Design a protein around this nucleic acid. Structure first.
Ligand SMILES: [Mg+2]
Ligand SMILES: [Mg+2]
Ligand SMILES: [Mg+2]
Ligand SMILES: [Mg+2]
Ligand SMILES: [Mg+2]
Ligand SMILES: [Mg+2]
Ligand SMILES: [Mg+2]
Lengths: 118, 146, 53
RNA sequence: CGCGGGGUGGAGCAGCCUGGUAGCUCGUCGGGCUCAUAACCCGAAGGUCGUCGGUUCAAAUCCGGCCCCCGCAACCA
RNA sequence: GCGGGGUGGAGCAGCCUGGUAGCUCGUCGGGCUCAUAACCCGAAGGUCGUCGGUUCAAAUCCGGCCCCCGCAACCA
RNA sequence: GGCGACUUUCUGGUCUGUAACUGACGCUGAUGUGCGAAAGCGUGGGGAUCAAACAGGAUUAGAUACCCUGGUAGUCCACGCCGUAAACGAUGAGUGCUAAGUGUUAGGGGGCCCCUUAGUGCUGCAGCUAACGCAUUAAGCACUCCGCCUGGGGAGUACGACCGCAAGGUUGAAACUCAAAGGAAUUGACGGGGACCCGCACAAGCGGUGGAGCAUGUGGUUUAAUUCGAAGCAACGCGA
RNA sequence: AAAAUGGCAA
């Protein structure tokens, strides 16, 4: 009934609209996840680093129940909450083995959406 | 559009209690420059609170103000929770005390004030509630603290 | 991949990570390709950037 | 005529099952903020749970009675 | 020939099921603005087509009259 | 016009050096003849992304927009068609001449430096220019040739022709009407432009006005007459 | 975020 994975990878996805944190095992199966919206942060608040911190904390606490003691941080997107989220993971007590940035960069691939004229 | 800060005025210690805060509280109670009425109200209120409390009037006053004064407040810039200035904190405490005393339904102002300070020491005072309300909104805007 | 050093602060490792990301310039690249710009405009911006350098 | 299901702030919707501990969400109502508007934030009010009995330390909760409502059988005077 | 409707200046509810006139706009007074518009605040205005009937009581039901509208007006 | 992963095949042009050869064989270029962004068009194919149109949501007095969520043609390929773009260096082509300083690309020559050739930038004389500016990459000084202009609007319209599947393209008036259209630069003013600064401007506070009654001024209305003047701030307990 | 308009002469 209870998972027992000591080592996992935490994926933090930071966007200007929202920040999402998911803790997964090394295999990549999700153990727990939390978001600013899930914690009830709305609108501008979701972007704020505090919201990201809280999201990281909530996800980490669940991960500790799964028995995760060491976690690897994977960062995606340019959202401001990324910095707080990484600190919050360690503040929760999950060991951060490593930090990596996985934000996707196309080698001149598909066309982007139009620029907003306002 | 302002050159800079202006030096603040100072108050003489209240003769009865040798406390600056007592002098400041008198001034807030005073209306139309009628000092005598304000002093009369505060001293009478202090005697009443002391009698009912069974503790030193200055002691309960200290406890009351401590409960009323707020650590954090929100100022629009969005509302951002900011540390209240120590001098500002005293101002807010005394201001709320007198204002809430006026809101109270006791016939005489001295009775109102004495009840408020006693209730403020109890932490059941309406001025203390104002502090609580100020703290609630500060916690709500914690994300906007930055 | 930046790995947190033994007996090192997580914040220190995060700082090192931030520096490594800055060296990569991956974030910068992502921001450039957030919105489409006309092909001529790209060349103009590139030329302006060269003039800035 | 049977079988099955349900009745809870103005309303919807849990706890019922696995008794003690009516929650949640809108509609409200007053404030704060917004130039503002909206949104958001803060405080306050409104169901004693369909009803009536029994049991029990304690029942919206369980067991019974009763009523209303719903769905399905019954649908060849 | 058979149905439907006629409610503030306008458009539209209330009628089924008698006692209860609503909404949006316009209007009038104030505010805002250099001024106007927009916006904001407050207020007024409908004998319910018209004559009758019934009823304690009629926008509400019932019977005429007038206006308006829809449909039908066929077979040799 | 354009051309940005790599590989191979086919293929054009250019530049340096040398001075084998030829021996003015050059230059421009009406009419022609080709090529020509994007959009569009035809036929066949393909369809990830993006996205005219179109549809919700929002915004707004309205919102046939801006923003959001979707989304068709199109965007892609082949073969035709179209033949236009602020197709711009708003600068036709060939040639020679006329200060310099400096960067870079592909060479050549001689001792990191110097010299030199063809490009590609910046700076800057003489000279030019209405001015801004240009200045060996002339908008300087000269010669050849071609294209083009002669106030604004009507109007790139009408008619005719030609061309195109169509959309349209090319060519291209007049009646009428005006006394001006314009280029550059200057001084102000202004900006939902910027920087630096002030003032109870705001903020932080305290006490009011707007509600009641009354006093007074004014508007309006009234009257035989309600005397005249003041009219946003800067008329309205103002002349009084 | 929204954010319209203002007789011709002098
Ligand atoms: Mg107006
Ligand atoms: Mg095309
Ligand atoms: Mg779109
Ligand atoms: Mg042309
Ligand atoms: Mg050169
Ligand atoms: Mg008044
Ligand atoms: Mg004008």
């Amino acid at each position: 009934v209870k998972k027992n994975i000591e080592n996992g990878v935490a994926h933090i996805r930071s966007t200007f609209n929202n920040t999402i944190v998911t803790i997964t095992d090394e295999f990549g199966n999700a153990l727990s996840w939390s978001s600013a919206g899930a914690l009830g942060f709305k609108g501008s608040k979701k972007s704020t680093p505090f919201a990201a911190q809280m999201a990281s904390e909530t996800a980490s606490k669940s991960a500790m129940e799964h028995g995760l003691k060491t976690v690897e941080v994977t960062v995606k997107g340019p959202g401001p909450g990324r910095e707080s989220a990484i600190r919050a993971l360690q503040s929760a007590g999950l060991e951060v083995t490593a930090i990596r940035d996985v934000t996707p960069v196309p080698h001149n691939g598909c066309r982007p959406p139009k620029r907003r004229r306002v | 559009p302002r050159k800079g800060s202006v030096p603040k005025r100072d108050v003489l210690p209240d003769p009865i209690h040798n406390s600056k805060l007592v002098t400041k509280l008198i001034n807030k109670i005073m209306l139309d420059g009628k000092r005598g009425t304000a002093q009369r109200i505060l001293y009478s209120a202090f005697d009443l609170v002391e009698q009912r409390s069974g503790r030193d009037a200055l002691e309960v006053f200290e406890e009351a103000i401590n409960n009323i004064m707020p650590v954090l407040e929100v100022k629009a810039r969005y509302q951002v929770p900011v540390e209240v200035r120590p001098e500002r904190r005293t101002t807010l405490g005394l201001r709320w005390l007198v204002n809430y005393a006026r809101l109270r339904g006791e016939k005489t102002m001295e009775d109102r004030l004495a009840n408020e300070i006693l209730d403020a020491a109890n932490n059941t005072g309406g001025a203390v509630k104002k502090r609580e309300d100020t703290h609630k909104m500060a916690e709500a805007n914690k994300a906007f603290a930055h | 991949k930046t790995v947190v050093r033994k007996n090192e602060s997580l914040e220190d490792a995060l700082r090192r990570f931030k520096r490594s990301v800055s060296k990569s310039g991956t974030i910068q690249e992502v921001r450039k390709r957030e919105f489409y710009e006309k092909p001529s405009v790209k060349r103009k911006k590139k030329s302006e950037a060269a003039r800035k350098r």
